[PDB]
Amino acid sequence: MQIFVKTLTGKTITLEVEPSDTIENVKAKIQDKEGIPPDQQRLIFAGKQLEDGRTLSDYNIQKESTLHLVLRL
Amino acid sequence: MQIFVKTLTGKTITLEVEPSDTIENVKAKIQDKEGIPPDQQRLIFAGKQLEDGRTLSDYNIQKESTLHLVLRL
Amino acid sequence: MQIFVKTLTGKTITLEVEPSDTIENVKAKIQDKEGIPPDQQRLIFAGKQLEDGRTLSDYNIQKESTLHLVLRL
Amino acid sequence: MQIFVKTLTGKTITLEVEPSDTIENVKAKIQDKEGIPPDQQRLIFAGKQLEDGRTLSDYNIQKESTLHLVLRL
Incomplete structure (x- = not known):
């Protein structure tokens, strides 16, 4: 599988x-x-910030999905 | 940070x-x-209605600040 | 709503x-x-000096109404 | 030499x-x-998935080393 990040x-x-x-x-x-x-x-995916423990399948992330990467500190 | 709303x-x-x-x-x-x-x-904060575009830092809103929430329609 | 003041x-x-x-x-x-x-x-509206507590609706003030502003001291 | 797999x-x-x-x-x-x-x-060894072509010495795998075996499909 491939996914993308913006x-x-x-x-x-x-x-x-x-x-x-x-x-x-x-x-x-x-x-x-x-x-x-x-x-x-x-x-960030479909309005939820992802949790380290869950999986891509858990959040219904398939091939061609685009996530969002916000950096904090 | 935490803030409050009345x-x-x-x-x-x-x-x-x-x-x-x-x-x-x-x-x-x-x-x-x-x-x-x-x-x-x-x-509402310190006498100004907040604007969707600005930020909490923009309006000098720190930890322990209390905002005011008026509903309209 | 808009109102006017003379x-x-x-x-x-x-x-x-x-x-x-x-x-x-x-x-x-x-x-x-x-x-x-x-x-x-x-x-001043329709012959009554307005009271700080009441509302525009209370005094039957609609869109396009003209109030009167007298300054004192 | 002996090595282990978990x-x-x-x-x-x-x-x-x-x-x-x-x-x-x-x-x-x-x-x-x-x-x-x-x-x-x-x-998997020291953070790298091993490649079929290389050797144990290539990856610095000595006696008493423990590899990791993940199955996929």
């Missing part, structure tokens, strides 16, 4: 994931590609 | 926000907790 | 109000536009 | 290997002991 600055990043991947596995791939600490990642 | 009927509601949260993010949390449409929310 | 000197001022606005909310908008202390405002 | 279900399996053994020789011993098709084996 940032508050307009930039998109592609990621290869699996329907079983947890949310903490998703930002941790984001830590491999862009270097952002996972603790400093907010991932 | 109503013309004497009831207070607690909200967890951030100094970067916009005013439209604030009533939209109020739409999650009490069900009121945001378009039907007036938020 | 002065003993012939000058008119427009105000945007609501049928629920009290009389003390009306002069206080007048304190924002012209700087006159509200305690120094008399508002 | 599964997402908590079970460990011992294997006898050599520092020259490739990763495809390692899952293929796993196909002899537990019957899992090698194509259906993920082998």
Whole structure:
């Protein structure tokens, strides 16, 4: 599966994931590609901020889905 | 950050926000907790009705601040 | 709603109000536009001097109404 | 040399290997002991998924090392 991520600055990043991947596995791939600490990642989908424990399937995230990544601190 | 909201009927509601949260993010949390449409929310602070575009920091709203929520239609 | 205000000197001022606005909310908008202390405002409508506590609807003030503003001290 | 393998279900399996053994020789011993098709084996060490072509020495896997075996499909 592939999914996409958009940032508050307009930039998109592609990621290869699996329907079983947890949310903490998703930002941790984001830590491999862009270097952002996972603790400093907010991932937003269909109006809910994702929780590290659940999975992509849990949140009904399929192929071609676009998440939102807000950074905080 | 936490802030508070008082109503013309004497009831207070607690909200967890951030100094970067916009005013439209604030009533939209109020739409999650009490069900009121945001378009039907007036938020009043230090004598000014808040504007959806600005932020809590913009209006100098810190931790422990109390807003006022007037409903119209 | 819009209403109008005339002065003993012939000058008119427009105000945007609501049928629920009290009389003390009306002069206080007048304190924002012209700087006159509200305690120094008399508002006259259909032969009665308005009371701070009542409302525009209470006095049957509709859209397009013209009030009279007498200043005292 | 001996190395160990842990599964997402908590079970460990011992294997006898050599520092020259490739990763495809390692899952293929796993196909002899537990019957899992090698194509259906993920082998994870020090944060990297191993590649069939490289060797145990290539990935700095010594005696007493513990790998991780994730099954997919």
